[PDB]
Ligand binder design. Sequence first.
Ligand SMILES: [Zn+2]
Ligand SMILES: [Zn+2]
Lengths: 150, 149, 75, 1180
Amino acid sequence: RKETSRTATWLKNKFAEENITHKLTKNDAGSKQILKTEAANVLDPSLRKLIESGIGTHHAGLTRSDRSLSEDLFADGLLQVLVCTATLAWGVNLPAHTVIIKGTDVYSPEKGSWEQLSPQDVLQMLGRAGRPRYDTFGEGIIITDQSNVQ
Amino acid sequence: PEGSFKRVKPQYDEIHIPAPSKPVIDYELKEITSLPDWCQEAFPSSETTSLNPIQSKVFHAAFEGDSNMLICAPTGSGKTNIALLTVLKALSHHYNPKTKKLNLSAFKIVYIAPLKALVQEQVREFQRRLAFLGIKVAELTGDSRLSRK
Amino acid sequence: LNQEWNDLEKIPFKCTLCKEDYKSPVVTNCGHYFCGSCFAKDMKKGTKCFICHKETHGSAKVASDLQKMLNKRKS
Amino acid sequence: DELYLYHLTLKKQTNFVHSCIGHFVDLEAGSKREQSQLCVATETHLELYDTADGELKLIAKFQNLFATITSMKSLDLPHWPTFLALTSDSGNLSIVQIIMHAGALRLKTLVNQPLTRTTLRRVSPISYMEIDPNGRCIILSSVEQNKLCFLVDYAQKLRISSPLEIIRPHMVTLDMAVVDVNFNNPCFVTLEIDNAATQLSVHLIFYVLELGLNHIVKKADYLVNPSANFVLSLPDLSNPFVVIGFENHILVKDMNGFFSLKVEIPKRSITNSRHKNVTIISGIVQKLKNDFFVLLQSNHGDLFKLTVSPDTNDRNRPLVQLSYFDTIQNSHQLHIFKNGYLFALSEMNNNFLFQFEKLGVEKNDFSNVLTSKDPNKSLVFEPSIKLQNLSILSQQLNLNPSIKSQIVSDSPLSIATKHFTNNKIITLTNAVNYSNLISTSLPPNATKLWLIPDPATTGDNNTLLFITFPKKTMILQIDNESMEELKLSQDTTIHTCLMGSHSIIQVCTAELRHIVPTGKSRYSNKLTWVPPAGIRIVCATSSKTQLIISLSNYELVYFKIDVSSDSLIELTTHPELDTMPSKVAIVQDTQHADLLAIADNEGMIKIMSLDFLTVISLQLVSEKISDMIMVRDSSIGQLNLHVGLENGVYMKFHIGDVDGSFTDIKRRFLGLKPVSLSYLREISKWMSCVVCHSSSTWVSYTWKNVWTIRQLKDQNMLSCSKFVNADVAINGVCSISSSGRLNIGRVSNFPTLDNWFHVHEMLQISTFRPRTILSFPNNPKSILFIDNHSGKKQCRISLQIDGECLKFGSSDHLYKILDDIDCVSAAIIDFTRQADHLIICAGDKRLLTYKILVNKDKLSFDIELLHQTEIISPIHAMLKFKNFLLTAMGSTIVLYGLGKKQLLRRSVTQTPVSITKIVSMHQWNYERLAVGDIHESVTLFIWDPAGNVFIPYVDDSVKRHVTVLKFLDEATVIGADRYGNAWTLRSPPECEKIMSNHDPSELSNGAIKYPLDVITLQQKLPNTYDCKFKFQLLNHFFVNDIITDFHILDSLSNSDRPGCIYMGLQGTVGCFIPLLSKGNVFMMGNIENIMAEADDTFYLDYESRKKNNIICEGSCSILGRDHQEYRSYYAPVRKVIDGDLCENFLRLSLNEQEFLAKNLKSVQVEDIIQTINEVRTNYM
Ligand SMILES: [Zn+2]
Ligand SMILES: [Zn+2]
């Protein structure tokens, strides 16, 4: 959950050196006033800065109030990025054209040490690649160590 | 699979694998007027009025036979309509054709799932889709055998 | 400091054109509100708001939020 | 009551005066460094080209500089890109690094050191800048007085030392060329001539910067003959040697005086007519592998090579050798890449890139090679047109001089002009180049047209082409080289499209049809939908997987093909409407589409959502909609509604995806006829444009964050749709002409704001250098051309009507050659209505009149001699006054009629005392004249019948040297200067009342009642107020070209605002557009003020943000110049608001735009950009 808002705010800045707006969000005319009014209902002040800029966040540490809000935006298109945990991939149905899995490392309280992401996860996350109604093909992207590439 | 190529970049090394082409499409996609009238209501036709290819080939195996079945498909391949054919398979035996009602107390059918959060999605679907037969689906909490009723 | 040298309701309920209940309501780039018949007829003469006299451009949204706040139940 | 003008630079000045050789930006490649890349500048303009692909590519054109670049030299400094050091007007030495920022290349400044004052002025140290080859120090000079040397250093940030001065008071300097050195101490050599002396003595003088003591020393000073022209550095000879080009020979000199070696430069055999002493104008040195050779070229273009050889026999001492190379056209400056490639920067036009394979005639031959053994001896050679040693590889078309031109075709705006060294016609147009190929006759009366990749053959190029007629519907089939004919033919076809894969659906007025492929040529119909009661379908639109139809009035019907298969499920439920849908649109690119667009006959548009449907928006627009389309372009992802109208007005709308709002309305007026759009997909990165059918076709693409409707050279196309084929087709498009005739085309050039005019028409050199161009007065555009020989005086004439030239009589040739005539100035004049005559002035002071005869229709031209007339003056100007030649002698005006046996003087007018020559003159409807002078400004006249003379009524205040002059209007005038100014003069209203209330005969003598004051000015100032009134200067503005022609156009491409489009010498086109608002001129004004000092604003924010918490002051202008100071220059601007500065606002990042715009209480950035962009779209 913590890496989420960290990755989300890192991208938000990484654009600020170069380009934002037209890349990150849509036209400012109508949609910004839609995003503004919907960004005033978010409970955690962290997200309020992100969600205004076009980067959403979905993790169980958020109340069901906002985790619905972040989807309604991202469903209608007002968000170009949604940084998530595995929680999205299981219960919620939220298709998108592209899905990036950043890092394969997860902690296993059984073994008391870090491990690699499991196949039934990796297969499950990429189930959200592509939207059946629109896109003729989905795209997954996996960013990991050289050793995992095997 | 052919078409794969590696771009060597300074920090990292990409591997692009191209997307597969759609398969060779043949035989017949099964029809929604081809179902027994009692099970025709379980499949809303408006978006389909047919079965996709995966559920089309498994039909004669599943719904027309009792044999063991191992169906290996991709993700998002429509399990919920597949395994529901096998449900409707076992429902026909205990089903009375004469009176449209059904014998409830005769049978149990058990749907395993890997996670609890993934159970509740299934339970909602069997509850909404099969509600017309008065079949009650429920998750198994079984705590201290309090729910045995 | 005012320099000469240099639950408010801002929504009238009856129209400024019909002077009647809002039916098929309309939003502009202002907070203006009209009937579908209202706004179309004003542009037959006027270039701008019946109120601001700002540029409407004939731009009109379906105003359902009006019917909401004109519901007793809001949305 | 004023006149407020807006300036654009349509095509930028193309005389490239400076070049530099390095590696500037790393582009497209993570790590690559290669010295092959070059940047080229001209005064204002600057550009960057690449090489190593074997052919010179344009990479970037940068923002508009607004200064005068007086030198440019790459400095490559040790320990890192190279960044071109750039000195200009403003007296700043500005070291600029071209860099990648945002998504496009920008030109970023590092260090601008102050020097002297702002203007181009003799003392100020620019115009000669030469750089230590290693990058230790830059050195600058002036002509006369001072020379500076700055000492470069690199650190965490680039750092300049304080300058190093030497001032020699009376010495005007020529050719500063600089010696390489191995890190010893930087030296340089100049040819200085003293300004105050009894005799001309021009002497060569060496300077050595001594890094040890840190000052510039004068080492050697040698007096050489007065002929000296240029210096060049010889690398090593292992006390450096220089090559000094004199007139008819070369020397080399050592600094210590030990060696002075003469080599008499070779010569041509023929020596045509005027032959100068020769000289040497360029001289690179390119050394490799002990091979030392230098290319050294002369006036005539001849190109020589030297080597310096040890001369083993005598001692080891120099031997110098001149031998011959390929030659070429003259070259301002030469450069050789680390590749074998050679770049020659031509002076008169058309720069080149050669690679040399042969490397010249070996030193061995004593036949063709000269040596330093005896200086007195002379070789003759025969110049070789074969071009053996070099090879062309590339060219760049520049129009360096453009001495005259005409406008042909107002609406698309074509300009006809010549080409100076090539002498071929060049038609420079604004439109979209549309090539035509394989037209074919279609049966009569077709309307629309469609195309679908043929579902029958899956994995084959075959493609269905549909036509439609009002009664009938035709179909056809397509594959490479194979075009053949072949499904409901008895009813009209509203819409037809593909669904999913391998399916078709054809909507016709009375009923739908659904088709699928079977086998090859057979297509079954799986189903047919029909109106419930029987009804006519008004309009039908579709998507990839989706479909919509609208019946007569009541309801709308919705189809979706079923997934996993091919099927159409109708609704169940069908929505209703208030009024009749006229037309409908839905995006056809994507396999699902939100937001249908419904139109009405009532004249408004509603939007629809696909919760489900709800009408989300309205626009109320004028006339009934004739047609509409909706398109999403990938880059911005903005979803655009493209709405034609009936009556000719075209419109466009930004659409919100989520909300459905209508914003950013963009209208236009194209032709007069309902519009009916159509849609395509093209390149140049991929792109999409919607052509528009009217009296003429307009394509309406959008380049990055602008959009430009234009026209297309094909008069019209009734419907147009994309096409893909072999012979290899990109941009290929098939369409139906307004004659109703099927044909193919390839749309080629699009006018992006960067280029905006597309030119259309071994080593190629013509002997005739063009002179003038004429147009027949009656025949609207049939353009005549005249040239002149460089050599024995001779003249050719070439006519063209419409597209391409004419033959001469029955002759092979398409031109005529007159002998012993050379044209000082010519005009064609119709003395009578039924014939046309040509008038030439020879230099001999003879005025010759020919007669033009077109056959019509052979068709060919004949020219027919008549008279010979003797004249006192050279006649620099003449024109058509009523029935007559109005010719201007040096002092005086003469008005000729036509007579047998000669032409005879029907009138004469002596000029008032000031005017020595008349450089040009122009009229207003036979009533008035306007007469320019060389030195004095301008005068107006009136034709007085019964007096038979012109009587001057108005003069000017200030001295202005006119090149050309016109009338925008009857009281006003537009002009130019030799020096670059462009001004407008209005005659005062005091004089307008009078000239309106009287008959001209009164002015000369008789009673005009003049106010008390005006007379007292005559007596008090007999010289100034002679006339007696003065123009009030109305506009003045400064464009560094010399404007040759103004063309006052009534409109440009149906625009309302009449423009006046000028064209310059160094090659240019620009325009002055009047702003008719009082509202716009305010806004545009505010935007010019915003962008004008931006570099000051950024700098004040940086200073004050350092004080409490874009480094250089000239950051945003890249050079020091203020705008008003530059654009003012000779005299202050009046009403002309610079629209080429306002246009840099498009090129800034959004952060900077929203930073600058904060200064306005008024509208937001988006509305600025709207305003700026409006001028190209709607006003031209
Ligand atoms: Zn109303
Ligand atoms: Zn208003």
